[PDB]
């Protein structure tokens, strides 16, 4: 049998040039794509001030406007989903994940415009969702779209142009090329069989888009927490404890996200309008919160820097936690277009900072800096809910630059999954495909 | 399909026992790697307490600084041919194969062989690294335990191996990430699904990294400090630098390959025509290690200096070729040691040069030579051993300049891309192939 192997060995890393030349177009478009989506979404959150400041006299007037605008938009969002692309509603990953296994379809001629404009609503409105996931999916579709415009055929160029368009997205999103790559090979990748995904093509897609992003976003990063202290050997165990904690909580947050989406289905039973209404309703609520304690609403990004600094009091955190634990589900379980990828980071930062704070006064001899654990746990709900430690671990380091906490971040993100395992729990990313792939069939 | 849905609900469920073995693997590799490195330094230490004592009569030195390196190299090659033919080499292509089941993990031989052997070759002062020596020694430490607790099953065999391996690459370059990323970009039997439990690798990696950290704190391997960042308009410059490693990547492959045949003739297969040619190359290195150390040695210690820019444009070129040779001649000779390390030094150098040219060719870009020295530090690593990701992340792991992460990719991609459209192949795999095709027949 050793015959075959030896032959394959001499034929390694030989991917067709045409593919590689498509990868570069995919990657590029995703770029301008991701950029645009983010520019627009900011512009609307912008208008939602040029509305609040104008009526900054009559209070309930605000509260009201800062509810209608968010609701009107969320609705326009949910609407553009149900009546045009049922798929889009959601993180966007489980689908891309499936299309890679050939169980779901890449209806890009729908998904793109839907997810794009849709999200601007929901997102620009100010709900508890990220705009990352929205780009991952939008990415994949941009890939397929080109795979269909140049008809190039073959399981390699189908899976490849997809996986990158996807990866190309996750990169331009968090301006994080590595993670973008490491994602497509720890998570998206059809997990139980060899696949014809050309790493080297992903790379080119990722790069190109990262450039596109960098062209229109230079000088400024997403998270600027500055260089924190390092973590001395004797304080390592403390990050394993913090892991176990995310480990037992990791799957719990999964049941809820899951369950909550059923319980929230009852409210509309499947009616575009019982949904579209419940939409602006949750959305508006968020928009109202975004002006009476913004740390409970919004993407969540902008509070991480603040949390990691330690500026929140022990209490204010706990409040920010729960509130978000809810406002997140309620917004994500609602099947609204947006990602649960981002707001999980914020959740982590928070839960982590707390653990920090406790640690700090519990042993003052370790000379700790709460922040370090805020970064330790920043990608911990990411290695328990979505169970992709490597993609998580590297996504943080990608955008917080504290490689002196790489040992702890692993020792924390390992305990994350380890208990998310010995206590039920599963890839919240995969579980959904399963539900959504089992609800497809068994329905006849 | 129905099957899929079932497998989905069963993801990331690896047997605890394995996971508890991983931790033992990882640990031992740790104390292992440590020891090997402590010892090797100790010998390079003695080779001064010998040079300083005879620092009066010159040719006396040159002589002692040749004998000691030769005596040790020989003790090295000897401990290989007469006891573990396999060990001689980087150590990776074997581990790579064992993962496919074509080669064997004769740990009851390899361990002591490779270990003590290396101390000779390495401690002597030849152009080889002590990293690869730990990758392999890693794998074996894995198996060893896989055999001592008899736990059976394709998963616990591949797993306990891959980590012992990964756990090595980590404690080596105090670089846990790369360690992991290695076992899943290179090592991993490339053309089929495998039962390697990532989560087990992780635990192994960690544990050894700790072991390493316990005995190496306060000091790192490369301290080049934070270099400037790289502005968008100067990106293309790193793609150029890639294409250059891309065409040179495979070339350095033929040679390493070829040179090992041409160096075989010299001994035709004779343990003694080899063992002699050994201390001979080795002694030569030990001599150089005292008349222009930048030509000899592991190579690590000159990267910091190169990246700074302290070498003149010439001195570099000299340090390049000399090493291009002193590297092959030492690695192609089948001696025990790794070509993984000295390729870093080659890159740092070739890169720094490209920096230097760039610097004066466009002063408007306000470039800092160093940044390209890091751009290309892992470029010969993405053309010769063609594992971009493991490379890219291994540098960042030990140079801390994540602001060059975009260039380092755009350089490391150009690397492979031309190492592709111009023949070339995984110098790591090529060898298994040769050695696996030379097996049968």
């Amino acid at each position: 049998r050793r015959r075959q192997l030896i032959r394959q060995l001499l034929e390694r890393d030989k991917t067709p040039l045409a593919i590689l030349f498509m990868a570069a177009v995919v990657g590029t478009l995703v770029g301008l794509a991701a950029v645009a989506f983010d520019k627009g979404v900011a512009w609307l959150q912008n208008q939602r001030m040029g509305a609040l400041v104008h009526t900054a006299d009559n209070y309930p007037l605000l509260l009201t406007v800062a509810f209608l605008c968010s609701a009107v938009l969320a609705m326009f969002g949910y609407f553009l989903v149900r009546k045009y692309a049922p798929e889009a509603g959601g993180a966007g990953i489980p689908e891309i994940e499936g299309a890679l296994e050939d169980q779901r379809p890449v209806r890009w001629w729908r998904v793109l415009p839907v997810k794009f404009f849709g999200g601007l609503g929901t997102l620009g409105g100010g709900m508890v969702l990220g705009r990352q996931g929205p780009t991952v999916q939008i990415g994949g579709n941009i890939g397929r779209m080109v795979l269909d415009i140049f008809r190039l055929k073959g399981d390699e160029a189908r899976h490849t142009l997809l996986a990158t368009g996807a990866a190309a997205g996750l990169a331009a999103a968090f301006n994080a090329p590595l993670a973008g790559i490491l994602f497509i090979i720890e998570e998206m990748r059809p997990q139980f069989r060899y696949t014809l995904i050309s790493i080297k093509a992903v790379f080119i897609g990722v790069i190109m888009s990262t450039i596109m992003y960098r062209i229109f976003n230079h000088e400024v990063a997403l998270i600027d927490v500055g260089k924190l202290s390092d973590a001395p050997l004797n304080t390592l165990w403390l990050y394993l404890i913090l892991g176990i904690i995310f480990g037992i909580f990791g799957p719990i947050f999964n049941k809820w996200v899951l369950g909550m989406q059923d319980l929230l289905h009852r409210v509309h039973g499947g009616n575009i309008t019982k949904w579209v209404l419940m939409g602006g309703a949750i959305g508006g609520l968020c928009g109202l919160l975004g002006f009476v304690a913004p740390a409970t609403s919004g993407g969540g990004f902008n509070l991480i820097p603040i949390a990691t600094a330690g500026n929140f009091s022990m209490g204010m955190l706990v409040f920010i936690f729960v509130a978000r634990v809810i406002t997140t589900l309620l917004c994500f379980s609602s099947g609204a277009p947006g990602g649960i990828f981002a707001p999980m980071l914020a959740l982590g930062t928070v839960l982590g900072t707390a653990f920090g704070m406790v640690a700090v006064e519990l042993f003052p001899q370790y000379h700790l800096e709460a922040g370090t654990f805020a970064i330790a746990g920043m990608g911990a709900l990411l290695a328990a809910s979505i169970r992709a430690p490597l993609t998580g671990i590297i996504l943080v380091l990608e955008m917080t630059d504290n490689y002196q906490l790489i040992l702890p971040m692993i020792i924390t993100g390992l305990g994350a999954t380890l208990l998310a395992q010995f206590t039920g729990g599963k890839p919240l990313a995969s579980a959904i495909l399963a539900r959504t792939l089992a609800k497809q069939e068994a329905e006849q | 399909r129905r099957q899929l849905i079932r497998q989905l609900l069963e993801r990331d469920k690896t047997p605890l026992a394995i996971l508890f073995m991983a931790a033992v693997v990882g640990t031992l590799v740790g104390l292992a790697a440590v020891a090997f490195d402590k010892g090797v330094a100790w010998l390079q230490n003695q080779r001064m307490g010998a040079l300083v004592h005879t620092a009066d009569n010159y040719p006396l030195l040159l002589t002692v600084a040749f004998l000691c390196s030769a005596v040790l190299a020989m003790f090295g090659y000897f401990l290989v041919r007469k006891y573990a033919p396999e060990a001689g080499g980087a150590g990776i292509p074997e581990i790579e194969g064992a993962l496919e089941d074509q080669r064997p993990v004769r740990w009851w031989r390899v361990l002591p062989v490779k270990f003590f052997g290396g101390l000779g070759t390495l401690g002597g002062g030849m152009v080889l690294g002590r990293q690869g020596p730990t990758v392999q020694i890693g794998g074996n430490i894995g198996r060893m335990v896989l055999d001592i607790f008899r736990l059976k099953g394709d998963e616990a065999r591949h797993t306990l191996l891959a980590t012992g391996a990964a756990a090595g690459l980590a404690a080596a370059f105090n670089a846990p990430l790369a360690g992991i990323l290695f076992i899943i970009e290179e090592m991993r039997p490339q053309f089929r699904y495998t039962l390697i439990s990532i989560k087990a690798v992780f635990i192994g990696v960690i544990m050894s990294t700790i072991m390493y950290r316990i005995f190496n704190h306060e000091v790192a391997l490369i301290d080049v400090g934070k270099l400037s960042d790289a502005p968008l308009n100067t990106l293309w410059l790193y793609l150029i630098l890639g294409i250059i490693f891309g065409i040179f990547g495979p070339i350095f492959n033929k040679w390493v390959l070829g040179m090992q045949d041409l160096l075989h003739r010299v001994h035709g297969g004779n343990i003694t025509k080899w063992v002699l040619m050994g201390g001979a190359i080795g002694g030569l290195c030990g001599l150089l290690g005292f008349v222009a150390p930048a030509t000899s040695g592991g190579g690590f210690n000159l990267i910091p200096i190169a990246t700074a820019g302290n070498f003149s444009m010439g001195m570099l070129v000299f340090i390049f070729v000399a090493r291009v040779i002193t590297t092959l001649l030492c690695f192609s000779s089948g001696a025990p040691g790794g070509i993984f390390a000295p390729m870093l030094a080659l890159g740092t150098v070739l890169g720094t040069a490209f920096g230097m040219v760039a610097v004066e060719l466009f002063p408007q870009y306000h470039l800092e030579a160093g940044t390209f020295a890091i751009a290309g530090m892992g470029a010969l690593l993405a053309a010769s051993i063609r594992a971009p990701l493991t490379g890219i992340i291994l540098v960042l792991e030990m140079t801390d300049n994540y602001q060059l992460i975009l260039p380092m990719i755009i350089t490391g991609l150009g690397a492979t891309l031309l190492a592709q459209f111009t023949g070339g192949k995984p110098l790591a795999s090529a060898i298994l192939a040769r050695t696996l095709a030379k097996q049968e027949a």
Partner: antibody
Framework: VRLLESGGGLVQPGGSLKLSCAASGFDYSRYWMSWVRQAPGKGLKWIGE????????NYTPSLKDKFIISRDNAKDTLYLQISKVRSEDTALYYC??????????????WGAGTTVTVSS | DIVLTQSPAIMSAAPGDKVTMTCSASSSVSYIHWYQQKSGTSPKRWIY???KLTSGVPVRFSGSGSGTSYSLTINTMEAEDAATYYC?????????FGGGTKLEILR
């Protein structure tokens, strides 16, 4: 971020004066410091630039050592030595801090000024 | 070295008016810059990379141009715009500044 340069003044032809420029309000390192002078009434003319580690220093097309820019990062101060001065050297001397956008460097934060008058 | 020559050497226009000043390069440039210099003060970085207003520059101002010829504009200039604008390039070493344009207000 203050860029305050002293030193200027009165110097007789064929003389030498060490202009100083003390920085404050930012990290001196990571920064390429330069000088540009404005001749009374006329425009600006770039003199030199000296990278962080001072491992690079360039000047305009001017001979040997008319100019000698240096910097003591230990004192976050930029220096400029003009030797064998002549009337063409009478102008306002600014020390700027250098940065860039897409990469085609600009003079970021120009300091105050200091005047050098060549006369007897 | 590049010879940047700013067109109007001196010009006057009444506030709320649309004013535009040119800056031609002898050869070829890209990503020009602009500095504003009001009497008694060292220059101030106004526009850059051919049209990126600096943090603070009124959105009144706009940059433009390409390769051989660039410009800077003020949609409805205000009186507080009286100053001397200097376009500068460094797309070719050594950098070079323009002759400057002196804006004067008609009131």
């Amino acid at each position: 971020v203050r860029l305050l340069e002293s030193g200027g003044g009165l110097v007789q032809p064929g003389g030498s004066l060490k202009l100083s420029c003390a920085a404050s309000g930012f990290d001196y390192s990571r920064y390429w410091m330069s000088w540009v002078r404005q001749a009374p009434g006329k425009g600006l003319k770039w003199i030199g630039e000296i990278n962080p580690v001072s491992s690079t220093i360039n000047y305009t097309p001017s001979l040997k050592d008319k100019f000698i820019i240096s910097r003591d990062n230990a004192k976050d101060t930029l220096y400029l030595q003009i030797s064998k001065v002549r009337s063409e050297d009478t102008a306002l001397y600014y020390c700027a801090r250098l940065y860039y956008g897409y990469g085609y460097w600009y003079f970021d934060v120009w300091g105050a000024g200091t005047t050098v008058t060549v006369s007897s | 070295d590049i010879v940047l020559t700013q067109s109007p050497a001196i010009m006057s226009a009444a506030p709320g008016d649309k004013v535009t000043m040119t800056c031609s390069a002898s050869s070829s440039v890209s990503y020009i810059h602009w500095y504003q210099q009001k009497s008694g003060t060292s220059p101030k970085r106004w526009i850059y990379d051919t049209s990126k207003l600096t943090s603070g520059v009124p959105v009144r101002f706009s940059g433009s141009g390409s390769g051989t010829s660039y410009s800077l504009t003020i949609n409805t200039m205000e009186a507080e715009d009286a100053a001397t604008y200097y376009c500068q390039q460094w797309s070719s070493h050594p950098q070079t500044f323009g002759g400057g344009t002196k804006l004067e207000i008609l009131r």
